[PDB]
Design an enzyme around this catalytic site. Sequence first.
Site, short mmCIF file in Angstrom:
data_model
loop_
_atom_site.label_atom_id
_atom_site.label_comp_id
_atom_site.label_asym_id
_atom_site.label_seq_id
_atom_site.Cartn_x
_atom_site.Cartn_y
_atom_site.Cartn_z
N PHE A 315 0.82 -1.22 0.00
CA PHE A 315 0.00 0.00 0.00
C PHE A 315 0.85 1.26 0.00
O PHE A 315 0.44 2.28 -0.55
CB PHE A 315 -0.90 0.06 1.25
CG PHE A 315 -1.93 -1.02 1.45
CD1 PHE A 315 -2.42 -1.74 0.36
CD2 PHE A 315 -2.48 -1.26 2.70
CE1 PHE A 315 -3.42 -2.70 0.53
CE2 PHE A 315 -3.47 -2.22 2.87
CZ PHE A 315 -3.94 -2.93 1.79
N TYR A 322 -0.11 9.17 -1.85
CA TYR A 322 0.33 9.94 -0.69
C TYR A 322 0.70 11.38 -1.05
O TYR A 322 0.40 12.29 -0.26
CB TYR A 322 1.43 9.19 0.07
CG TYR A 322 0.93 7.86 0.61
CD1 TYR A 322 0.00 7.81 1.65
CD2 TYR A 322 1.27 6.66 -0.02
CE1 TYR A 322 -0.55 6.60 2.07
CE2 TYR A 322 0.73 5.45 0.40
CZ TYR A 322 -0.18 5.42 1.45
OH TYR A 322 -0.70 4.23 1.88
N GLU A 423 -7.59 6.61 5.14
CA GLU A 423 -7.49 5.87 3.89
C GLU A 423 -8.21 4.49 4.07
O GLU A 423 -7.62 3.43 3.88
CB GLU A 423 -6.01 5.73 3.39
CG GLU A 423 -5.01 5.09 4.37
CD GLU A 423 -3.57 4.86 3.87
OE1 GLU A 423 -3.34 4.98 2.64
OE2 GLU A 423 -2.69 4.54 4.70
N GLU A 432 -14.87 -1.29 2.37
CA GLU A 432 -14.07 -1.61 3.56
C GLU A 432 -14.73 -1.03 4.77
O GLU A 432 -14.16 -1.09 5.85
CB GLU A 432 -12.63 -1.13 3.41
CG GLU A 432 -11.92 -1.81 2.25
CD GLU A 432 -10.42 -1.65 2.26
OE1 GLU A 432 -9.91 -0.82 3.05
OE2 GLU A 432 -9.75 -2.33 1.45
#
EC number: 2.1.1.320
Lengths: 625, 311
Positions: A315, A322, A423, A432
């Site tokens: 990730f 980022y 995130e 998620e």
Amino acid sequence: RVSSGRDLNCVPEIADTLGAVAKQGFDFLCMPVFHPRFKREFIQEPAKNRPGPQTRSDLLLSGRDWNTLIVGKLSPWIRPDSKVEKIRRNSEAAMLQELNFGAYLGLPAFLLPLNQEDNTNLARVLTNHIHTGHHSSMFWMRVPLVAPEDLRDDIIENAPTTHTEEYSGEEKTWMWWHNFRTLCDYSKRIAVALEIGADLPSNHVIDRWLGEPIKAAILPTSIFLTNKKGFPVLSKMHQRLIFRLLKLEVQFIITGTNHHSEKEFCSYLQYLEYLSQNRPPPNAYELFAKGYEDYLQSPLQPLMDNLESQTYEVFEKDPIKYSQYQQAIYKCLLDRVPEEEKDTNVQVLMVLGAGRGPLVNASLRAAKQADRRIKLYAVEKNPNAVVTLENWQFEEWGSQVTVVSSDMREWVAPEKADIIVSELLGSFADNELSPECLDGAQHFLKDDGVSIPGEYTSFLAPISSSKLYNEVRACREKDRDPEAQFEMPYVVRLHNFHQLSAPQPCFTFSHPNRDPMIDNNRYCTLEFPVEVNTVLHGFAGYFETVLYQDITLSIRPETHSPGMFSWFPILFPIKQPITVREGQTICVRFWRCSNSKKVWYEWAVTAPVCSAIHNPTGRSYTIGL
Amino acid sequence: NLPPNAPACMERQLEAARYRSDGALLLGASSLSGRCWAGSLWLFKDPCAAPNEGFCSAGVQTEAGVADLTWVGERGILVASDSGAVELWELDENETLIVSKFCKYEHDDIVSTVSVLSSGTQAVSGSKDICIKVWDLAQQVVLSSYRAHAAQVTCVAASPHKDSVFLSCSEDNRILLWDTRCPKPASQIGCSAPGYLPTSLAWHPQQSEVFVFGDENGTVSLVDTKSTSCVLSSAVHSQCVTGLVFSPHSVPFLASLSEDCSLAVLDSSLSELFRSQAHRDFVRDATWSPLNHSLLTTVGWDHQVVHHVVP
Ligand SMILES: C[S@@+](CC[C@H](N)C(=O)[O-])C[C@H]1O[C@@H](n2cnc3c(N)ncnc32)[C@H](O)[C@@H]1O
Ligand SMILES: [Cl-]
Ligand SMILES: [Cl-]
């Protein structure tokens, strides 16, 4: 480079022939296993008792050569669907005899033609041979893009060629393949050997083969144009097709005699190699995606499960993600505190689901860039990730970062936050459970506080892929519903497929959620205009997020953030494929459901025909809360 | 003794038998099984000596099998090869050797049929590649390439006396009448219903607008190109009609080959006059003797060169 094969219907000496094709550069050979003209009788005497041998011996080649360099060819006289009973019966016995000889030899693949509309008995005999044993052999169906009847010279005075447009009629060889493989119950052992002709059909006819198991492309020597130097070459439209096929990693097959007499058989293959080398290179995404193409993976549940260390590592190696989070915080810091307050006002920043600490670092790089003061909290439920966070905070971050080993839904914060940064997003955005996570955390956000990300939206698109449908089909497991695999989403680099309609938004979530009665459950109806004849196998899911203002992330192919490999598309399959005709609308229904324990999706197709509601009550798939 | 070039053995599968005007016998053969899949061309000045190798006038070996054959005059041999090549083999000055005149690979699959046109200067080949090609035997080139059929070409037959006219038939169920003079050369002839696939064609030697055709279901049919609706037919064989050959007689007799391993001789009304069960395998060719018109020869896959006496 290119994996090439030579097709021959004449092999006088097997040892010599193979050596010549190997010298010519070919990686394998398609050749008859019996003599093509050797018609055999199995019923009537005297022809029945014909003395042997029936063919050449297996001793003539090594086991390794038989296994890796020879693709068997069915005899052209074998006609299981002849209108003559005797021919039907002899061709059946001969087909069984021929297929069994190829299995006896351990051949990697065997070729069978689809050269007419009715192949019901051909299919029956093959299907019966497939169920006689348990082997890994591949059957390549030799199908042309254009039926020979539809490309015949207009030289029959009293039978002219139809010069009118016939949309569905031009797609007829796809129907031959579809029927044959439906009859054979989508055997993974049955693939396409696509024969490309001198004149290419309309694009819709070519596009009809998207999502199909093409294992080989057959290029006859006839289709090759000749350049000013006398070398065999191809038309730009034929070159287009070759490039589409090279991405499908098909094995190219060269059939027919050499019409470029001045040059050898290596020149046809040389041009393919030349095209193969000159095509555009694989980008940052394409290079990462290699190997994951049409590979079904389970979607991650970082809430219910604790992610492995090498999973955060993966990730974290996404630069664009980022850089974008940094910029969104940078923009928020300046809008929240003016230059006159750049030393008196310290912003309460909370990373909700901190992992190993990339958003914590990004928040720090953003407060240095904006020249503003921040007070960081790093909230993480995964205690294993919290080990990394605490070793980072002691060794580097210092008192500035307060690591909180808790679930954001339960944590009792000492003070409210100015900005909450997270995130918690999946390939379908909210898969998620980011809505629930941030809903139980927003109480400790200031009445005017910013949530990064501020918004996210899931998208859906209808897809056709007989390849991926068969892949999902193979996911049957014991001790569960024999059809549970079709009632769950998969994360996959959708590769061999056809997007039937433009993505359309499905579910949207906004943070903070102002609603007095917060309900994350949803119901959405989408209507997808389809302008091709096709078969629907499922729906691709993508997402878009607004981190802050104009700073966004997207996996929607239209607006895909360049070089971002953190998310691959999700796929929602359907149990039974659905035929869609050109001009029809695909209507889908999607639900986002929940109770106190779990969240799941349910879906159904209502047009052009109904499907069963998939995953009712989350019986096959749930996301743990 | 074996001629200086002739191999010690002739391949088991006899495909062709062609009686020359003088009475010599042309033999085409292939190895359709075993280690090597090749072919051979044989000349027998004594037809009663065939198939005995060490008793032939000349012999040679082709690289591949012989699917079809035809005499090209008196010293010419036209070969339909599995290689996809059309080959012309020229017979020796002493007629003791068979030397390769030309080998041209123009077809993309097995060449299964060849017919020499009335002039004897042109020929037409029919292949599995679905094309029909018109050749110049002197120039060694293809004048015209025709993709009229939708499936493989089973049979191509030049008209007895017209260079422009020839018949063709295919697994696409089409019997095509050709005429190189028309801008659209082929014309789809045939009876009302499609029926069983056409397998063999025989032009009538006297009535230039008449021919016979055998199907895959053993039926033999009499066809007038003018009336274009098959008037006479008979179920002669129980399997595919491999070939149809007319006798040299004023009023010709029609010989009929089959995969049912039998030969039959028919009259004008397609009635059975003779039948031979001599063969234990597929009957591949038939030639009537130019010397004795009541004598008919046959070759099969059982390696038999039978000689019949036709009443
Ligand atoms: C690392 S991000 C996952 C982003 C990743 N690139 C993807 O594809 O989804 C998720 C992090 O938030 C944490 N997290 C999830 N739910 C949480 C909760 N309720 N409280 C605290 N941390 C939570 C997880 O343990 C994990 O470290
Ligand atoms: Cl085909
Ligand atoms: Cl395609």
